[PDB]
Amino acid sequence: GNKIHPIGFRLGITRDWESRWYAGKKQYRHLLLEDQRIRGLLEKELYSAGLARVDIERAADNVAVTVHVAKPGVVIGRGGERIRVLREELAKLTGKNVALNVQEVQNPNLSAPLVAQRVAEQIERRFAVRRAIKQAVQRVMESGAKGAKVIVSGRIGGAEQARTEWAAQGRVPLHTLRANIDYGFALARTTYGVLGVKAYIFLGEV
Amino acid sequence: ARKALIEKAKRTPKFKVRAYTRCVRCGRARSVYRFFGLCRICLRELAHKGQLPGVRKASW
Amino acid sequence: SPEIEERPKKEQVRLKHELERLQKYLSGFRLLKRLPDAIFVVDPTKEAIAVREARKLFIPVIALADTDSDPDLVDYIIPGNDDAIRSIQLILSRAVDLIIQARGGVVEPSPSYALVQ
Amino acid sequence: EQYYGTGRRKEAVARVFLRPGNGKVTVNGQDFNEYFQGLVRAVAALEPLRAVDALGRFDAYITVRGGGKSGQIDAIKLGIARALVQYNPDYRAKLKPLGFLTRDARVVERKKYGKHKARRAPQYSKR
Amino acid sequence: ARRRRAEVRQLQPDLVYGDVLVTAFINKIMRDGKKNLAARIFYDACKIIQEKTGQEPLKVFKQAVENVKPRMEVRSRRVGGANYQVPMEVSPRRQQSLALRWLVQAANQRPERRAAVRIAHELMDAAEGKGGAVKKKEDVERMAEANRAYAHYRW
Amino acid sequence: GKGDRRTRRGKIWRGTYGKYRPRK
Amino acid sequence: KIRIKLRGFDHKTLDASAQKIVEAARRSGAQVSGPIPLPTRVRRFTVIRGPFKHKDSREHFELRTHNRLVDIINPNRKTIEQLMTLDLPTGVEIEIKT
RNA sequence: AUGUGGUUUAAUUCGAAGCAACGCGAAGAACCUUACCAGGCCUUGACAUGCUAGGGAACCCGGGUGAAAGCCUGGGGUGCCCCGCGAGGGGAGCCCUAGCACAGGUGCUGCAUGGCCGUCGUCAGCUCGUGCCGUGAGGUGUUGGGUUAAGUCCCGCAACGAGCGCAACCCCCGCCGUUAGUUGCCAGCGGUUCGGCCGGGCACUCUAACGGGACUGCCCGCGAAAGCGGGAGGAAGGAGGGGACGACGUCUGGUCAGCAUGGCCCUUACGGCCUGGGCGACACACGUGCUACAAUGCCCACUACAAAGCGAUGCCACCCGGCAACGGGGAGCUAAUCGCAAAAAGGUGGGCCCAGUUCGGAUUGGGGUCUGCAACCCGACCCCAUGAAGCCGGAAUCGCUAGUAAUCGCGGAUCAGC
RNA sequence: UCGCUCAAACAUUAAGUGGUGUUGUGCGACACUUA
Ligand SMILES: [Mg+2]
Ligand SMILES: [Mg+2]
Ligand SMILES: [Mg+2]
Ligand SMILES: [Mg+2]
Ligand SMILES: [Mg+2]
Ligand SMILES: [Mg+2]
Ligand SMILES: [Mg+2]
Ligand SMILES: [Mg+2]
Ligand SMILES: [Mg+2]
Ligand SMILES: [Mg+2]
Ligand SMILES: [Mg+2]
Ligand SMILES: [Mg+2]
Ligand SMILES: [Mg+2]
Ligand SMILES: [Mg+2]
Ligand SMILES: [Mg+2]
Ligand SMILES: [Mg+2]
Ligand SMILES: [Mg+2]
Ligand SMILES: [Mg+2]
Ligand SMILES: [Mg+2]
Ligand SMILES: [Mg+2]
Ligand SMILES: [Mg+2]
Ligand SMILES: [Mg+2]
Ligand SMILES: [Mg+2]
Ligand SMILES: [Mg+2]
Ligand SMILES: [Mg+2]
Ligand SMILES: [Mg+2]
Ligand SMILES: [Mg+2]
Ligand SMILES: [Mg+2]
Ligand SMILES: [Mg+2]
Ligand SMILES: [Mg+2]
Ligand SMILES: [Mg+2]
Ligand SMILES: [Mg+2]
Ligand SMILES: [Mg+2]
Ligand SMILES: [Mg+2]
Ligand SMILES: [Mg+2]
Ligand SMILES: [Mg+2]
Ligand SMILES: [Mg+2]
Ligand SMILES: [Mg+2]
Ligand SMILES: [Mg+2]
Ligand SMILES: [Mg+2]
Ligand SMILES: [Mg+2]
Ligand SMILES: [Mg+2]
Ligand SMILES: [Mg+2]
Ligand SMILES: [Mg+2]
Ligand SMILES: [Mg+2]
Ligand SMILES: [Mg+2]
Ligand SMILES: [Mg+2]
Ligand SMILES: [Mg+2]
Ligand SMILES: [Mg+2]
Ligand SMILES: [Mg+2]
Ligand SMILES: [Mg+2]
Ligand SMILES: [Mg+2]
Ligand SMILES: [Mg+2]
Ligand SMILES: [Mg+2]
Ligand SMILES: [Mg+2]
Ligand SMILES: [Mg+2]
Ligand SMILES: [Mg+2]
Ligand SMILES: [Mg+2]
Ligand SMILES: [Mg+2]
Ligand SMILES: [Mg+2]
Ligand SMILES: [Mg+2]
Ligand SMILES: [Zn+2]
Question: Superkingdom of the source (chain D)?
């Protein structure tokens, strides 16, 4: 099929830029370039607590690196040491005024990227690939959502021929704009290859 | 020669007519926009993600 | 309810069309939200589709039945005409009479004689 | 006193300042028969005036900009209409059935991708 | 299309005489969408009309298109697996279409240098009863009466 | 001729000016 | 006398910050010409979808770079402090000159 | 002109293979890009982490041989922390040489894969829940009658609802106003250099932003319902035109050369560097295109009307040289107000006179300009000359239903230039 | 300008086979199939 990326589809209306800020035609590249390496370093030494929406804001030497996480208890350590040394390594290679505004997540089950990375990991840890998707979608709908959808793809378990396991419930009108459906991609390293993950959570309306 | 070339692209030892464009993200050799400094591929990838500020889906 | 302010003309008439058809068939069934202790019918043959349901659900079967019928598959039979408003009226009246007579306050039968002609 | 109306077609706008008088018609300077030369659509733009039965009795002054040469003419055609109908409610009861009050939605469409001209696709082949 | 008949394109009446048939002729003349060019080219011949004969270009145009209006034509049709050249009446519109069309072509056939003089002389021979376009009309009508045998399938 | 290397539209199509084409 | 430029991307954020300045300058000083929208310079970028060969079905984006202009006349000392303190920009790179 | 098959070559890199490969990956092959060859060189490496050992400030200039890479070498120099006024020692940053773990691979496998894309096709479809029928595969619903762009809606119906699709919410052009006034107005008045140039103004044009509006709403006729046809008002009627949006899936489709990636294979070379050559080869064939084979026209002088876009190491108005490309002097520009810019076709006037032609510019000789270390291979562009094939084309075959086709100019991306 | 045989190249096919269709050599005046 096709199915253009739902996020790029709601880009204008529903959800706004995962990275919001202005730039002149002079250095847009260099700005977004460093803006990129930032979020990459975060995805690395921060995935522990399970980060998702790495929001960013810039204008002039100011950069609000708001990082949404399932449990900030790990991103801060104790009193203020983990978070502090994080701002350290941040501006350590950069030059802008780093300002890590951490924020919790009301419910990881209703946060698609988390839901994905979650189950995607279960597969890496060798688990029931079929029912893992079943519980995941059951977790989200029973949680409080109004629509759910999860899809893995690749060598399920380790079979030669490829395969794709479809599973979902509720509604997921991907063709509609006023839906506010969070997208949740995720990798999955296996001793036998790669493995794709998808996750759709319908929530908002009007 | 993929790794040694992305490094040589940033070298510019001799004359300027060797400092050819080179995508930053996936380090593509062609289709590199100068404005973004990216290849057409990774460009679209990010655009769907929303990591490209002001870059909205064109419709007219 | 004061909630009619929203809902465009589209959903209005459609939702009204809902109520219309909803009452068009359900009017007379919604009054009870449990499985009837029994069933009464005008012609076991025609509506035997329901008779089966009740039958398979062990629900006792009573119904007025003309010669064009299947006696054995009815628990408590009501032999006699059925394709005539005259015969149907006399039975339904006297039947429901036993309902209110075992209930309380025996009233006068509903205005049926006028509708008959 | 004056009769005003707005003209527009293919992004070719045209203000219409009309003042009852002779027949002298100025549009962005120059004369009407002067600016439009060798074009039959010219006398057609004055069609609203022939419908009202007052050709030589009105001094026109129009500010038409943008668009093409002819798109302006169609802008003038609808502009004069709104002008004379502005001070005449009864002249709408005979200018409308004759078809005059319409922006003419007919406009060039976007050249689609993959195609060549919004519709004309490159020569299909299989050889 | 398979559904609707698709209605004709009601064209704009003449801007000099007041007749749809005349404007339609301009369109057939119109090369590369130059109406104003073809319009003049048509009115050029109208003046060549009054030059030769003291006759109005209006009726000289009607008489020409009328004498080149094909009354009947042969159409191909399948039957079990065979093509018959069945003759039959044409539609009023199609007659006007072909007539106007052939005339334009007949002008192109002429050795005349200027386009206006080609349409001029051709409009004469057409209104008369013998011209390049008219002879192409007489020709098509022959095919009709010739295959009059297969006219049994009027359909 | 949109291909004549020495004409009005000859340079207009090639996006140039030159002699035969007016230039400042 | 003074002229302010309000370049930026999102017109929703540009409208909030442009309207904010108009209230703060007029409600505490001389006259001020309201928000003057300019021709939005847009960067339309077209490109192909698939990685390999697919000279069709291609996708394209556009960079909406808005423009808004606001002129304050009399150099009020209240308006200078008002705009210096009561401001809530973000992705709106403003530039002001006399 | 360009891609392709084929052939040729030391190499003429590889991929896509009916539709759905062939102006396609390429939105920029002169060395670069570059993955192929020849030759000259390096080989713990151009790049990531880390370890044992000698010496050393991190840093900068030149010389011999050479095509360059590189190979041999000489010179100027001596910061910071811990102990002392000095010597001397260790560490971090960084390097050479030797050695270990290891790097790197455009080398296979797209039937090992993720991701992304084409496709049937925006076609009208595909399913789930329970109930009911069948021993069961499965059926029913979704069938039927009317209608519709549509599984759209209506009526009927052992079925009753729902979900993924269709529609709708998203933007442009369509009518007008609201908000703002350095876009525009002899419109209304004063100077007139008779140029909206100055004063002034925003109603009107515009520049963008918000909102209303069209809903089978009205009437007539058919109809049970849904709905169709005709007429008015209206900027616009039955989705108004266009775009974004392309389901369960199929094509064991495509892509390991975008990238990530399981496994296999190379590891003084399947890795690295340079120079030159080669994707540009030519007895041939096919696809997609430009321009013509002309008098609705060719050469030329004057005049007028666009939309959108781009412009600091870039767009170039004014003046001079020459036939000109082009060069030089030099003003303005973080860009509705400076430049690219004359839009072309078209309107008036002139030669032309049916001729391989004032049509047609392909080919080839000589002389110039631009960019770049470098235009033989292999760039573009002037000027003078040579003025070829070529009379609207066989069998076959493509596009397109209206502001469409056809036809005529303009802009950008890419980009040293092309 | 026509009638005819034969050997290429191209077109119809999804592809092959065959055939069919045009231009090239010398003279006389669609059907079938597809490990
Ligand atoms: Mg679990
Ligand atoms: Mg990367
Ligand atoms: Mg009763
Ligand atoms: Mg009309
Ligand atoms: Mg067009
Ligand atoms: Mg338009
Ligand atoms: Mg358009
Ligand atoms: Mg031509
Ligand atoms: Mg140009
Ligand atoms: Mg000069
Ligand atoms: Mg090949
Ligand atoms: Mg390969
Ligand atoms: Mg294949
Ligand atoms: Mg070798
Ligand atoms: Mg290291
Ligand atoms: Mg030393
Ligand atoms: Mg030292
Ligand atoms: Mg040396
Ligand atoms: Mg020394
Ligand atoms: Mg040391
Ligand atoms: Mg290895
Ligand atoms: Mg595949
Ligand atoms: Mg795949
Ligand atoms: Mg393949
Ligand atoms: Mg059973
Ligand atoms: Mg049995
Ligand atoms: Mg079933
Ligand atoms: Mg079925
Ligand atoms: Mg206002
Ligand atoms: Mg106004
Ligand atoms: Mg109604
Ligand atoms: Mg009503
Ligand atoms: Mg009536
Ligand atoms: Mg109705
Ligand atoms: Mg009705
Ligand atoms: Mg009407
Ligand atoms: Mg009305
Ligand atoms: Mg309708
Ligand atoms: Mg849709
Ligand atoms: Mg691999
Ligand atoms: Mg790996
Ligand atoms: Mg070896
Ligand atoms: Mg102009
Ligand atoms: Mg625009
Ligand atoms: Mg440019
Ligand atoms: Mg200059
Ligand atoms: Mg400026
Ligand atoms: Mg200009
Ligand atoms: Mg002319
Ligand atoms: Mg000649
Ligand atoms: Mg010549
Ligand atoms: Mg050369
Ligand atoms: Mg013809
Ligand atoms: Mg033939
Ligand atoms: Mg450039
Ligand atoms: Mg033959
Ligand atoms: Mg031979
Ligand atoms: Mg012989
Ligand atoms: Mg003979
Ligand atoms: Mg046969
Ligand atoms: Mg056989
Ligand atoms: Zn890239």
Answer: Bacteria
